[PDB]
Structure formats: structure tokens, C-alpha cells
Amino acid sequence: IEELLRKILEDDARHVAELEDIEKWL
Amino acid sequence: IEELLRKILEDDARHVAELEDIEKWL
Amino acid sequence: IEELLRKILEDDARHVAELEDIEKWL
Amino acid sequence: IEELLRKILEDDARHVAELEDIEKWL
Ligand SMILES: [Zn+2]
Ligand SMILES: [Zn+2]
Ligand SMILES: [Zn+2]
Ligand SMILES: [Zn+2]
Ligand SMILES: [Zn+2]
Ligand SMILES: [Zn+2]
Incomplete structure (x- = not known):
């Protein structure tokens, strides 16, 4: 467990980073 | 993007699956 | 716990749905 | 979007926080 x-x-830490990148790019 | x-x-679909198993093991 | x-x-189930929506819209 | x-x-930032506490309680 x-x-x-x-x-x-x-995964979620990485998701935060990835989504912040996507927000910048958009 | x-x-x-x-x-x-x-990943989140997999997280649902993993969390569901963790609930069972706990 | x-x-x-x-x-x-x-939250993750909802995130899957939300991200599928965003994929359609993009 | x-x-x-x-x-x-x-949400994912909060998930990191919650998972970290769950690790401590377990
Ligand atoms: Zn995530
Ligand atoms: Zn997740
Ligand atoms: Zn399962
Ligand atoms: Zn999520
Ligand atoms: Zn999450
Ligand atoms: Zn904590």
C-alpha cells in the first residue's frame, strides 16, 4: 500500500507541473 | 497539448483503479 | 483514511470526465 | 478551459498534501 x-x-506532483505548463502554453 | x-x-483512470484496490486492502 | x-x-473520476471534455473542446 | x-x-496539489498525511497515519 x-x-x-x-x-x-x-503522479499528482507531475500533473501539477504538466498542467501549469499547459496553462502557460494556452 | x-x-x-x-x-x-x-493516469487519473489508473488512480481510480489503484485507490479502489487500496480501499479493499485496507 | x-x-x-x-x-x-x-476527484480523479471527475478529472477523467473534465479532461475528456477539454480534449473535445480543444 | x-x-x-x-x-x-x-486539486492535484491538494491530493499531494492528503496522500502525504495518509502516508503518516499509515
Ligand atoms: Zn493527478
Ligand atoms: Zn490522480
Ligand atoms: Zn480493483
Ligand atoms: Zn486527478
Ligand atoms: Zn489527483
Ligand atoms: Zn501533511
């Missing part, structure tokens, strides 16, 4: 939660956390 | 959004949404 | 996980799951 | 993306990214 801890490893799966860590990876979801990782 | 469209491709990147697609990847992000595929 | 279960209630917090349920709400994250909810 | 830009406003909706902003809301989605704010």
Missing part, C-alpha cells in the same frame, strides 16, 4: 500511494503522489 | 492531456487523464 | 481516499477517488 | 485546468491542478 505505501509504495502504491507514493507512486500516486508522484 | 492534446496528447499530454490524454496521458494525464489515463 | 477511508473517507479521504474515497474523496481522492471521486 | 484555462480556469478548469487551474481547478484540476489545484
